[PDB]
Symmetry: C4
C-alpha cells in the first residue's frame, strides 16, 4: 500500500520467547534440504520468512563436499516459509550471489546480491523482483554487505557495504536506496575503525546497526543512521561486556571510541538492541569459538563504559555450536511498540566437526516478551554420526 | 469477515461417514513424511486442515529413533492439507512447542504452542500468524493444553490449560482470549477432580469440553463453558459406559460427580458429543490398551447414571491400534445445524510395536450423517515388517 | 459465477491432437509418485485437472505390493495439475473411496466417493469441499459409480450408480443433484440390460453417457439424459463395430436394443461421441485384452445397425497396454462449439506384466481438431525391467 | 489488462550482470530433477520463468538412459520458477511436444508445442492454457520452431516455423497469431538461405530474430518482422565475427546476403542484439564444439562487413560446455528502455561426456547493465564423476 515509516519505539524486553526454528540438519539427513549458511529472517507486511545463501547442493548430495568455501558461482540468496527447512522444492531464489541483504519498504521488497571474483565483484539491486541498479566494486577486494535485513523508512532503505581488506582499513559506504535507485552514498564517518556485516533495526525514525570490526575490536561498532537527513555516525559499544568472537575476557572498563584490543583479524556477525536501560546484547558464550549463545541485559551499554549485566537468558548451551546472529522485527505487526527479534545461525559440519565434508546450518529465532518467561536452550539437534 | 457465533445446534447423528484419512505411515515408508503425534483437525472458514506436533524428523530418517519422547526442542505445531500426509514439503509450521491448540474465530486463527523445560515452560499465543501474548508456567510442572482445537464465539475463544502434577490435584485454568489477548482467566470449578487434554465443540452459544482425568477417573470429566458470561462448571459423565483407557469393565451404575475408581494415573484424550438423546461417546474397544475404537449412542449419558448404549459403530477393530481422539466441526459449512465430527490418532511404532525405534501415527476422521450408513473399519494400514 | 448451461453442440471432429500426458510410471521409477488406477480428467472454469483413485502408496514403496485389488480403506479420489504425475506432494485429496465421479457446475465442484465393505458401502457427496449428502447401499452389492466426470446443466448434475450383481441384472439409478442435494432419483429405463461405469458428455441441453454392460453385451449401452425434465432413456449402440473388451469379432450387422452376444461377464469402461455423421467410437485394438487403442469415425453408429468406419486414428499401438477410457470437455473454453476430448488409462504391472507386484497407470488424453492432423502413438513409456 | 506494445528501445549495454542460474545438474544429483534440453526464459507481466523440454524422467532415474534423442512421446514443454531447478514437484507442463515457443501478449500466454513422427508432425497452439489452433506439417519433414520465446505487439505474436530438410532448402513460414488464431502466414523472404531456431526480441514496434542456417552459413541470418504491417525481410549478419558453431576462423571481411562458407550441415541456436553501435553478439568460444561462451560488442555488425569487436565479456570459459542460447526481455519491467537479456544452455552428459548415459543441462542467464561491471564465468558446476 504505502511506504512503511518507523513510528514506534521498542517494546520493553523482559525476556525472549521462541519464534521460529527449522531443524534443517535433522530433517536434511533424509530430505532434499539445501546446504546453506549466512541465514537471516525478514518480514513482508503479510508474512515473515527465513533467508540464507544456498550452496547449490543438498546436504546428502555429493556436491555437499566443499561447502565450507564462501564464494562460488553456485550460491544464491533463497527465502522459504518460516520454520520450514530450506528445501529444494519450497525455496524461492531472490538473486544470485555470495553476500546479500533484503528488506521490504512497505510497498515491495528490495534484495541485493553480490557475486564475482574477489577483484571484480558487483552488487545488483533487485526491486519488486526485477534487477534495477548495479554497483561495481570500488576497492577491488571482495565487495560485501550485511548478511541480514536492511531497514526502510518512507521509501529510503540504507544499506552498508564494505569493499577492500578484511584486516586493515577498508572502504565502507552507506547507500540510501529508494525503489531500487541510489539516492546518495556516503563514506563511513565517526570513530569506528572497521565495519563488516551490519545487523540493523529501526525505531522512532532512526536506524541502528551493530556491526563487526574484523581488524582489532572485540567490542562492536555501531552505526546510527538517519534515513530522513540521510546522514550517519559511528562509535563502539562502551560496555566491558565484549560481544565479538574470538575475544579477550571482559575487563572492568570498556572503550567508546576505539577497538578494545585482544584478538586480531577475526570476528563473527552479531547484533544488539540499544535502548537505554532496555538494552540487550547477544554474544557467543565461548570467547574462543562460535559456541553457545546468550542474551544479557546491560543497561546503557552503548554509552556506559562500566556497564555490566543485570539480567540474562541462555539461548544455546556452550556445548552446542552457534554462529552468525542478527536482528529483524515485524514492522507490520499490530501493537503500540516494535517487538525486538533476532536469529542465531547454528553451524554444523566444518571446520569444527571434521567428520563430515560439508558445512551447513539450521536456524533458531526469538522475539521479546514483556513477561519474564522461563528459559530453555535451543541447539541444532542433529547427530553428526548419522551422516557418516 | 466477521467473528463467528455459535448460533446452531448439532445435527441428528444416526451414523458416521468417512471424512478424511491420510494413510501417513503407509506412504511415509517411501516419502519424506514427518514423524508426528497428538494430531487433530481444525477448520478455517474456507478450508479444513490436519494438524499435529512434528518430531522434527522423517519416519525413515535416522533421527526417527527416539520419537516416543514427548517434549524436546525439535517439535513444532504443523498443519497440512486434509487427507494429505504431513510431508516435509507441504507442511506449514504454526508455532514451536510440545503441546498446543488452535482455532479460527471467524476473522483469523489463533494458535498456542507451549515449550520449555518441565519446570519453566511457557505458552506463546499467536494470532494472525504473529506472537501476541505469552504466559509463563504457574505451577512449574509441565504447563500443557488441549491437543485439539479450541472454539470461539463472537471473538472469545476459551482455552483450558493445566499446570502441575499428572497424578494428583493440579492447577487448571480457563483463559478467555480475544484477538490473542487475555480477557480473563478462571480457576477450574465444579466437581471434576483432574483435567487434562480437553476436547471441545460448540453449539447454541455454549461450549462443551470432554477432558481426561489422569488421576483416578475412568469416566470422563466435562467442562461446560459460557463464552458470553465467561464462566464455566464441571462434572463427570454419569453413564456406566466408561470411556477412558485403561479402565475397569462397565458397571451397571455410574457416577456424576466423582471419578469412577479402577485404574490410576493414566488415560487417553477422548471426546463425546453430549446432546440429550442425540449423545454419542467414543472409546477404545480395549479396556487395557489403546486398541480399537468405537462410537456408542448412549442417550443422556451426561446426566443418566444408568444410561447404556442404544446403537453403535465400530471405527477401528480391536486388533488395530488407536490413540488420541478429539472433536472438531466445520462451523462455516452451509446448513441448518452443525455436523459433529471427530478424529482418531492411529499410533504405530513404540511402545506396542517394539520392532521399530520410532513412534508416529496416521489419522482417520469422520463426520455425522442423519442417514444410517453401513460401517467399515479404518485401520492405519502400514505393515511394520516393511520398516525393518 | 453462475451455473453452466450446455448451450453449444460438438465441434466437427476431423482428427485428434495430443492434450495431456503425465508419463507417471517413467517418472515414478525415481520420484514419489502415487500408485493409481481408474483415472479421468475434469475441468473447472479456470483449470483442467487429472483425477484418479490412489492406492495410498508410491510405486517404489513396499506397500505397492498388492495394488491390483480394487477396494480397500487406503484409496482416495485425488486430483493434480494437468500433465504432472500424481505425486505425494502435488496431489489434492477430494474424498475417501474406491469408486467416484466429479464435475464442476459452474459455481463449484461436486465430488462423490464411495467406500465400504461389499455389502454395506455408502456414497458421500461433497460440494464445495464439504460433505453434504450421503446415500447408503440399496442392493448390498458394491454400490459403484462412473469413474469419470459427471455433467451439469443449470445446477443439475445427473450421476449414474449401479448397485448389485456384476454379472446379472442389477439395480441402476440416475440421481439428479443440485448443490450436493438430491432432487430426485430414477430407476434405469429403456432397453439397456446392464449398466456400469458411464462416460458422459453434454451438448445442446442433453447429456449422453456411453456405459458398459458387464453381463452379456459387446456393444455399448447408451443413456441419454434430459437434465431439465430430469428423465432418461437407454439403448445400445447399433453399429457392428463392437467397442467393449473382451469382445467377438465385428459382424456385418449389429443390434440396437439387445446386447450383442459373444463374451460374458467382463468388459472395460469406454466412451463414444455420438453426433450423427460426426460420430467417433473408441475401442481397444485387441478383442482379447486391454491392449492398443483407436478411434474410428462410424457415421450414425447409434442408430445405423450396419454402420462401418469411414476414418480412423490410432492412439496406442496394439503392442502397448491401455485400459479405461472416458470423455470430458472443457465446457468453459472460448469458442462456438464444445471440443470433444477423452483420456485413456495406460495400465502397467499386474495382471499382464507379472514381473512386478504392483498395478498402476499413466494417462494420455486428446481433444478433437477440425483439421486432419497426422497421427502418432502414445504408449506409457516405462520399461518394466527397471523396476525389478 | 491490455495487449503489450513494443514502445521502447534497448537500453545501452555496457556490460552484463547475472540474472538467473538454476544449478540443475549439481542439485539433480540428489533431488528429483527432470532431464531437460532446449531451455529458455520468458516473462509474464508479473513473473519471469524458466522453460525447457522435459525428457519425462529424472536425471538419476533409470529412464535417463537415452535422453540424447530429440523427439519422443515423453517430452513436454515445462516452466518453473526463475533460478529453481526443473523438479518433478514445482514444474508446470505447458504442452506436449519436442519443439516449442511461448510468449505473453500482455493479456495472457500463448504456448505452441509440436509433436509427432518425423513425417506427420503437427503444431497445437495453446492460448490461456487451452488448445485453440492446430497446424499440420506442410513439408512432411520435422515441423519445428524457435525453441525460445516469441514476441507480441498489440495482440499479434509472429512465430517462425520451418518444415522440411535440415540440410537443404526447406519451407519456412512466419505465422502471425492473435489470441491463438492465425491472422496470416507468409513464406520466408529476403536473402537468408536457411532458417532454424530463431531467437527474437522486440523494440520500437519492430521484431528482430537471429536464427540459424544449418545448411552452409557460419554467419547468422536475421529476420526483421513488422508486426503491424505483418511483413518481414531477411539477410545475414555482415560482420566477419562469425557466430555459428561449428564454424571457420574469422576472416577480415564478411557477407551480408550469402552464407559464409566453411562448415556444412550443422550449427547451434544463438542470438544477437542488433542496435547500431549498441550491438552485441553471442558465440561459443570454440569454433569446433559447443564449448565456452562470450559476448562481443561489434558496432553495426548487421550492416558493416568489416566490423570487429570493440569490447567483450566472457560468460562460460572454453573449458566448460555451453549449448543453445537465446534472447528474452522483461517487457513489463519499469524503465525508459528495454533491458536486453539472454540465456545459455549448459549441456552435460552425451555426446561429449560419454561416461554417463544421459544428456541434460542447467541454465545461466544475464541481462544488460549500463555500468561496466566486472566479469566472472558461470559454468554448470556439476562433477560428472559423482554420477558414475
Ligand atoms: C527459569 O527461567 C528463569 C528466567 O530465565 C531463570 O532465571 C534467569 O536465570 C538466568 C541464569 O542465572 C539469569 O541470568 C544470569 O543473570 C545474571 C545477572 O543476574 C547475569 O550476570 C548472568 O550472566 C553472567 O553469567 C553467565 C554464566 O552464568 C555468563 O555466561 C554471562 O556471560 C555473565 O557472566 C560473565 O560476564 C560477566 C560480566 O562481564 C562477568 O562478571 C562474569 O564473570 C562472566 O565472565 C566470564 O564469562 C564470560 C562468558 O563466557 C566471558 O566472556 C568472560 O571473559 C568471563 O570469562 C546470567 O545472564 C537471569 O537473569 C534469570 N532471569 C530471571 C528473570 O530470573 C531460572 O533459572 C529458571 N528456573 C529454573 C528452575 O531454572
Ligand atoms: C451394516 O452397517 C450397519 C450399521 O453400522 C450394521 O448395524 C450396526 O451394527 C452394529 C454392530 O452390531 C450395531 O452396534 C452395536 O449396537 C448395540 C446396541 O444395539 C450396542 O450395544 C453394541 O455395543 C456393545 O457391543 C460392542 C461389541 O459388539 C462392544 O464393543 C460395545 O462396547 C457394547 O458392549 C459393551 O458395553 C455394553 C455397555 O456397557 C455392555 O452391556 C457389553 O457387555 C459390552 O461390555 C463389554 O465390552 C466393553 C467394550 O470392550 C468393555 O469395556 C466392558 O467392560 C465389557 O467387557 C454395538 O454398538 C449398530 O447399532 C448397528 N447399527 C444399525 C443402524 O443397525 C450392520 O452389521 C452392517 N451390515 C452387515 C451385513 O454387517
Ligand atoms: C499421417 O496421418 C494421417 C492421419 O492419421 C494418416 O491417415 C490416416 O490413416 C489411418 C490409418 O490407415 C486411417 O485409419 C484407417 O481408416 C480406415 C477407413 O478409411 C479404417 O477402416 C481403419 O480401421 C480399420 O482398420 C484398423 C487396422 O488398420 C483396425 O484396427 C480398425 O479396427 C478397422 O478395421 C477393423 O474393423 C473393421 C470394421 O468392422 C473391419 O472391416 C476390419 O476387418 C477390421 O476388423 C478386424 O479388426 C478389428 C480391430 O482389431 C477387430 O475387432 C475385428 O473383429 C476384426 O478382427 C483405420 O481407422 C485414417 O482414416 C487416415 N486418416 C486420414 C485423414 O487420412 C497417414 O497414414 C499418416 N501419414 C503417414 C505417412 O503415415
Ligand atoms: C574486470 O572486468 C572487466 C570487465 O569485464 C575486465 O575487462 C574486460 O576484459 C575483457 C577481456 O579482455 C575485455 O574483452 C575483450 O575485449 C577485446 C576488445 O577490447 C576483444 O577484442 C576481446 O575478444 C577477442 O578476444 C577473445 C579472447 O581473448 C576472444 O575469445 C574473442 O573471440 C576476440 O578475439 C577473437 O576474434 C577477433 C575478431 O575476429 C580476432 O581479431 C581475434 O584473433 C580472435 O580470433 C580468434 O579467436 C576466435 C574465438 O575463439 C575464433 O573464432 C577466431 O577464428 C580466432 O581463432 C575480448 O572481448 C573487455 O572489453 C573488458 N571490458 C572492459 C569494460 O574493460 C577485466 O579483466 C576484469 N578485471 C580484472 C582484474 O581481471
Ligand atoms: C571478506 C572478509 C570479511 N568477511 C565479511 C568474511 O570473510 C565473511 O566470513 C564468514 C564467516 O563465517 O566468518 C562468512 C562470509 N561468507 C559469505 N558471506 N559468503 C564472509 N564474507 C564474505 C563476503 O565472503
Ligand atoms: C504431562 C502429564 C499428562 N499429559 C497430559 C501427558 O503426559 C501426555 O501424554 C501423552 C500420551 O500419549 O498419553 C502424550 C502427551 N505429549 C505431548 N503433548 N507432547 C503428554 N502431554 C505432555 C504435555 O507431554
Ligand atoms: C463391481 C463389478 C463391476 N465393476 C464396475 C468392477 O468390478 C470394476 O473393475 C475394474 C476393472 O478394471 O475392470 C476396476 C474397478 N475398480 C474400482 N473402481 N476400484 C471395478 N469397480 C469397482 C466398484 O470395484
Ligand atoms: C531438425 C533439424 C534441425 N534442428 C532444428 C535440429 O535437428 C535440432 O537439433 C538439436 C541440437 O541440439 O542441435 C536439438 C533440437 N531438438 C529438439 N528441439 N528436440 C533439434 N530440433 C528438432 C526439431 O529436433
Ligand atoms: C509514511 O509517511 C509518508 C509521509 O511522510 C506517508 O505518505 C505514508 O503514507 C506513510 N506510511 C504509512 C504506512 O502511513
Ligand atoms: C456475531 O455476533 C456479533 C454481535 O453479537 C456480530 O457483530 C457479528 O457480525 C456476528 N457474526 C456473524 C458472522 O454474523
Ligand atoms: C536407536 O537408539 C538406541 C539408543 O539411542 C540404539 O541402541 C539403537 O540401536 C538405535 N536403533 C537403531 C536402529 O539404530
Ligand atoms: C444458465 O441458465 C440460467 C437460466 O436458465 C441462468 O440464470 C444462468 O446465469 C445461465 N448460466 C450462465 C453461465 O449464463
Ligand atoms: C508381495 O506379496 C506377496 C504376498 O503378500 C509375497 O509373496 C511377495 O514376495 C511380495 N513381493 C515382493 C517383491 O516382496
Ligand atoms: C497497445 O496499443 C493499443 C492501441 O494501438 C491499445 O489499445 C493498448 O491499450 C496498448 N497497450 C497498452 C498496454 O497500453
Ligand atoms: C543404457 O542403454 C544402453 C542401450 O539401451 C545399455 O547398453 C547401457 O548399459 C545402459 N546404460 C546403463 C547404465 O544401464
Ligand atoms: Ca573482531
Ligand atoms: Ca483416567
Ligand atoms: Ca461386456
Ligand atoms: Ca551453420
Amino acid at each position: 500500500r504505502d511506504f512503511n515509516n518507523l513510528t514506534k519505539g521498542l517494546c520493553t524486553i523482559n525476556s525472549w520467547h521462541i519464534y521460529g526454528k527449522d531443524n534443517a540438519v535433522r530433517i536434511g539427513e533424509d530430505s532434499d534440504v539445501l546446504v546453506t549458511r549466512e541465514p537471516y529472517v525478514s518480514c513482508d507486511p503479510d508474512e515473515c520468512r527465513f533467508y540464507a545463501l544456498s550452496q547449490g547442493t543438498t546436504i546428502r548430495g555429493k556436491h555437499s563436499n566443499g561447502t565450507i568455501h564462501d564464494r562460488s558461482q553456485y550460491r544464491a540468496l533463497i527465502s522459504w516459509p518460516l520454520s520450514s527447512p530450506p528445501t529444494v522444492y519450497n525455496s524461492r531464489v531472490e538473486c544470485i550471489g555470495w553476500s546479500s541483504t533484503s528488506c521490504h519498504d512497505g510497498k515491495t521488497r528490495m534484495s541485493i546480491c553480490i557475486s564475482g571474483p574477489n577483484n571484480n565483484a558487483s552488487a545488483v539491486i533487485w526491486y519488486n523482483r526485477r534487477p534495477v541498479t548495479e554497483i561495481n566494486t570500488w576497492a577491488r577486494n571482495i565487495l560485501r554487505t550485511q548478511e541480514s535485513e536492511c531497514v526502510c523508512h518512507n521509501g529510503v532503505c540504507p544499506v552498508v557495504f564494505t569493499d577492500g581488506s578484511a584486516t586493515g582499513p577498508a572502504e565502507t559506504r552507506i547507500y540510501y536506496f529508494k525503489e531500487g535507485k541510489i539516492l546518495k552514498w556516503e563514506p563511513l564517518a565517526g570513530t569506528a575503525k572497521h565495519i563488516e556485516e551490519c545487523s540493523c533495526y529501526g525505531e522512532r525514525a532512526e536506524i541502528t546497526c551493530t556491526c563487526r570490526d574484523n581488524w582489532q575490536g572485540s567490542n562492536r561498532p555501531v552505526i546510527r543512521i538517519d534515513p530522513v537527513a540521510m546522514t550517519h555516525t559511528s562509535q563502539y559499544i562502551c560496555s566491558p561486556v565484549l560481544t565479538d568472537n574470538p575475544r579477550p575476557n571482559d575487563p572492568t572498563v570498556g572503550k567508546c571510541n576505539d577497538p578494545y584490543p585482544g584478538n586480531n583479524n577475526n570476528g563473527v556477525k552479531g547484533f544488539s538492541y540499544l535502548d537505554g536501560v532496555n538494552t540487550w546484547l547477544g554474544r557467543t558464550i565461548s570467547i574462543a569459538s562460535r559456541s553457545g549463545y546468550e542474551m544479557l541485559k546491560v543497561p546503557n551499554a552503548l554509552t556506559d563504559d562500566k556497564s555490566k549485566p543485570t539480567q540474562g537468558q541462555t539461548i544455546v548451551l556452550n556445548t552446542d555450536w552457534s554462529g552468525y546472529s542478527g536482528s529483524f522485527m515485524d514492522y507490520w505487526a499490530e501493537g503500540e511498540c516494535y517487538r525486538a527479534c533476532f536469529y542465531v545461525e547454528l553451524i554444523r559440519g566444518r571446520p569444527k566437526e571434521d567428520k563430515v565434508w560439508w558445512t551447513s546450518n539450521s536456524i533458531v529465532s526469538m522475539c521479546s516478551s514483556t513477561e519474564f518467561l522461563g528459559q530453555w536452550d535451543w541447539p541444532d539437534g542433529a547427530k553428526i554420526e548419522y551422516f557418516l
